[PDB]
Design a protein around this ligand. Structure first.
Ligand SMILES: *C[C@H](NC(=O)OCc1ccccc1)C(=O)O
Lengths: 212, 4
């Protein structure tokens, strides 16, 4: 069911924060553990700020904190080009339950279209289930990221789900879960943007995990 | 849309 997939997502969601060495942590959004010490996280969380690699990355797993130098996480792309969401290996994180087999297969994508879905996410660790209207797939999606200083950058990704719904700041990194029980309520991707009552999630397929 |  949607709710049981949501429970598996919930258990693998951590809060992602960034800070200067010896400074306060800025808690930015969610990251989703997928297997071993690998997580999915929107790279817009960190990559547009100056000297990201000299920062400390923080992972909050239910009030137990894990930190690491940004230079010591291994970042791997989901596919060619910029997809925002990346795979991130974090050697200091406790191993995750492997939830990769619960992600949609590329070939099954059409089966989630035109059906409801649920965004399984948090706002700074408080779990929320957000209804999303019948899904469409945008071959390219563009959204605006506001940086810390106030300036903005336009981001464009390939293959992003679009659904009607109401999101809030901090919900990025949550997982979109199909209402379709015939594909076992597959995880469809990762929430990256929202506005004007529409929610956008980057498609993540099982096949993408082959990038290790 | 804004990055969320
Ligand atoms: C949610 C996970 N399920 C899983 O990996 O399914 C694989 C499977 C299940 C039944 C028949 C064939 C393959 C889990 O934690 O097990």
């Amino acid at each position: 069911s949607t709710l049981e997939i949501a429970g598996l997502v919930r258990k693998n969601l951590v809060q992602f924060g960034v800070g200067e060495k010896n400074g306060s942590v800025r808690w930015v959004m969610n990251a989703l553990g997928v297997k071993d010490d690998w997580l999915l996280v929107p790279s817009h969380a960190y990559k547009f700020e100056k000297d990201y690699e000299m920062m400390e990355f923080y992972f909050n797993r239910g009030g137990t904190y894990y930190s690491i130098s940004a230079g010591n996480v291994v970042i791997q792309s989901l596919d060619v080009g910029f997809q925002d969401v990346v795979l991130m290996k974090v050697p200091t994180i406790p191993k995750f339950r492997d939830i990769t087999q619960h992600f949609i297969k590329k070939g099954d994508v059409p089966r989630a279209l035109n059906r409801l879905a649920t965004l399984v996410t948090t706002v700074n660790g408080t779990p929320m289930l957000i209804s999303e209207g019948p899904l469409k797939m945008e071959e390219k999606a563009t959204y605006v990221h506001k940086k810390n200083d106030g300036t903005t950058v336009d981001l464009t990704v390939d293959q992003a789900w679009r659904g009607k719904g109401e999101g809030l700041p901090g919900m990025c990194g949550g997982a979109l879960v199909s209402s379709n029980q015939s594909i076992q309520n597959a995880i469809l991707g990762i929430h990256v943007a929202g506005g004007n009552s529409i929610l956008v999630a980057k498609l993540v397929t099982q096949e993408m995990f082959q990038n290790i | 849309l804004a990055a969320q």
